[PDB]
Curated annotation (Swiss-Prot):
Dynein heavy chains probably consist of an N-terminal stem (which binds cargo and interacts with other dynein components), and the head or motor domain. The motor contains six tandemly-linked AAA domains in the head, which form a ring. A stalk-like structure (formed by two of the coiled coil domains) protrudes between AAA 4 and AAA 5 and terminates in a microtubule-binding site. A seventh domain may also contribute to this ring; it is not clear whether the N-terminus or the C-terminus forms this extra domain. The gene is DYN1. This is Dynein heavy chain, cytoplasmic. It is found in: Cytoplasm, Cytoskeleton. It comes from Saccharomyces cerevisiae (strain ATCC 204508 / S288c). Belongs to the dynein heavy chain family.
């Protein structure tokens, strides 16, 4: 985001430095080319976390049903993350 904004700023400034223009353009191109294989390897990882999550939301729900049962057995989500 900051590179594309600064690139537009450099382009309007050049309208009213081509070396650093080309270098930041190459930097912009590289921080994309490396985003190509990063995403399918990123999102392929989390299946470990889906089995984590489906248990986590069930555990919190069970403690919540203990909280609706008796007024003393209350629990917040902040305490769940602190214990996590």
């Amino acid at each position: 985001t900051e590179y594309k904004l600064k690139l537009k700023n450099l382009e309007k400034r050049l309208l009213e430095t081509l070396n650093n223009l080309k270098k930041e353009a190459m930097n912009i191109e590289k921080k994309l080319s490396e985003s190509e294989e990063f995403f399918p390897q990123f999102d392929n990882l989390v299946e470990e976390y889906s089995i984590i999550g489906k248990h986590s939301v069930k555990i919190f729900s069970m403690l919540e049903k203990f909280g609706q049962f008796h007024w003393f057995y209350g629990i917040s989500i902040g305490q769940f993350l602190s214990c996590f």
